[PDB]
Amino acid sequence: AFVQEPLPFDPGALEPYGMSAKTLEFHYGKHHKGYVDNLNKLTQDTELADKSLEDVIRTTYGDAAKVGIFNNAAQVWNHTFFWNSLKPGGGGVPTGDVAARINSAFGSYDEFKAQFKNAAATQFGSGWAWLVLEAGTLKVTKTANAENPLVHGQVPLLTIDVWEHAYYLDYQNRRPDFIDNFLNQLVNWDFVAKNLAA
Amino acid sequence: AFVQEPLPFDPGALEPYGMSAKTLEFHYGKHHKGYVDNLNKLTQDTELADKSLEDVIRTTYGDAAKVGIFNNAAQVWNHTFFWNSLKPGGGGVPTGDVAARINSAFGSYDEFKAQFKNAAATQFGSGWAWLVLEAGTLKVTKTANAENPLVHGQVPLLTIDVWEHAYYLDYQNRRPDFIDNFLNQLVNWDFVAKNLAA
Ligand SMILES: [Fe+3]
Ligand SMILES: [Fe+3]
Numbered sequence: 455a456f457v458q459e460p461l462p463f464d465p466g467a468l469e470p471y472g473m474s475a476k477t478l479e480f481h482y483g484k485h486h487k488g489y490v491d492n493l494n495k496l497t498q499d500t501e502l503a504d505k506s507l508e509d510v511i512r513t514t515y516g517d518a519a520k521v522g523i524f525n526n527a528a529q530v531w532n533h534t535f536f537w538n539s540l541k542p543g544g545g546g547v548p549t550g551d552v553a554a555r556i557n558s559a560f561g562s563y564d565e566f567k568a569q570f571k572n573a574a575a576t577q578f579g580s581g582w583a584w585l586v587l588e589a590g591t592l593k594v595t596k597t598a599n600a601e602n603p604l605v606h607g608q609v610p611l612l613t614i615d616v617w618e619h620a621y622y623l624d625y626q627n628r629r630p631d632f633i634d635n636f637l638n639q640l641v642n643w644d645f646v647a648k649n650l651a652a
Numbered sequence: 653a654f655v656q657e658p659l660p661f662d663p664g665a666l667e668p669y670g671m672s673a674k675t676l677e678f679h680y681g682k683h684h685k686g687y688v689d690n691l692n693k694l695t696q697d698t699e700l701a702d703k704s705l706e707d708v709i710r711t712t713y714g715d716a717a718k719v720g721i722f723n724n725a726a727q728v729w730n731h732t733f734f735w736n737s738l739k740p741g742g743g744g745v746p747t748g749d750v751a752a753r754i755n756s757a758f759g760s761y762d763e764f765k766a767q768f769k770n771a772a773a774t775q776f777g778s779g780w781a782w783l784v785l786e787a788g789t790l791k792v793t794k795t796a797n798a799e800n801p802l803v804h805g806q807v808p809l810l811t812i813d814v815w816e817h818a819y820y821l822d823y824q825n826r827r828p829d830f831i832d833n834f835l836n837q838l839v840n841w842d843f844v845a846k847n848l849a850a
Contacts, residue, residue, distance in 0.1 A: 484825040525776055578723055579778035579797040580816075599777040618778075618816035619825065627682045627817065 455494045458487050459534045467542040472635035477623050485619055486533040493526040507531040508604060515605040528600035532582060536615050541642040548643045552650055559592040567637055569594040574614050574633045585612040587650065611649045653692045656685050657732045665740045670833035675821050683817055684731040691724040705729040706802060713803045726798035730780060734813050742838040750845050757790040765835055767792045772812050772831045783810040785848065809847045810839065
């Protein structure tokens with residue numbers, strides 16, 4: 455069946471960098487695994503058992519009869535993408551082709567950071583902010599709930615989860631501080647670069 | 653300006669009943685006050701400064717230029733309605749006209765509890781569940797983000813907040829347990845009866 459991808463680092467390894475071991479216990483151990491479980495419950499009898507996360511997402515998006523499958527598949531994919539977007543001793547500025555394309559779409563890295571932070575801060579309710587490639591240019595986006603750039607004809611490059619469970623144990627109501635900490639200590643530009651190259 | 657309605661009980665008084673003092677500190681002290689502060693920022697300039705929350709909510713519903721005012725006013729109203737939906741030593745069964753009308757619509761109080769819990773448990777993302785009166789009968793509804801029954805031509809009687817901040821410090825991912833705790837130890841049937849009689 456669908457299997458939860460292992461975390462790309464030890465679950466306590468982000469604690470010096472602003473994301474607690476307790477957060478990883480609940481967010482990866484309970485929320486993310488829960489989405490895998492519900493995805494499996496709703497697909498293992500069906501034609502979608504044989505299908506990639508991405509294909510399940512794109513197939514079931516917009517289908518009023520398959521909202522459960524969509525929401526779970528999208529969340530499974532989103533919270534693998536999110537863990538890959540983090541690393542112990544992240545932060546710093548992007549280099550190489552990523553940095554060049556950020557400068558050309560946003561003017562500078564700082565101007566990207568402001569737009570990315572605004573997106574993440576202003577998604578009202580539960581959701582995600584993203585760096586994406588669309589029509590050969592980089593863009594910052596925000597999505598609601600389980601939505602994700604795959605359903606908007608975009609290539610995802612980076613995400614931050616702004617569902618309250620992502621940050622509430624460590625920042626409570628302080629989403630903006632959570633977002634700053636992500637940019638300052640956790641963002642994984644190596645992942646972004648791999649995504650852009652492909 | 654708009655003033656945050658005082659909590660109807662001491663902020664530590666729900667602790668033996670499944671809602672911690674810490675939760676009240678953050679939820680009432682920070683989240684709720686924040687919405688008031690934002691509502692005041694966006695309205696004290698204007699025509700809407702003297703309006704009841706209910707009137708701001710109905711007036712700005714659907715207005716593409718006033719989403720911020722809508723969301724904040726709706727959340728100020730929703731939180732106040734939530735605190736009133738709670739009491740120390742709540743729970744038990746409704747009586748009187750509330751009970752008769754629940755029996756008429758749901759068949760029994762236990763069936764209401766099932767329907768209410770289902771609604772609260774399945775609102776995906778951030779939102780609220782409600783008992784409402786509409787077209788002479790009771791029903792359960794759920795809403796997203798800041799929406800509430802006032803913009804659906806329904807009279808709200810009871811609510812539970814299912815934004816993750818409402819429960820995450822006390823139950824983490826365990827929303828179903830949070831909802832059971834509300835029904836068993838917190839729901840304020842007196843408030844429901846007041847709302848119904850009006
Ligand atoms: Fe998450
Ligand atoms: Fe709330």
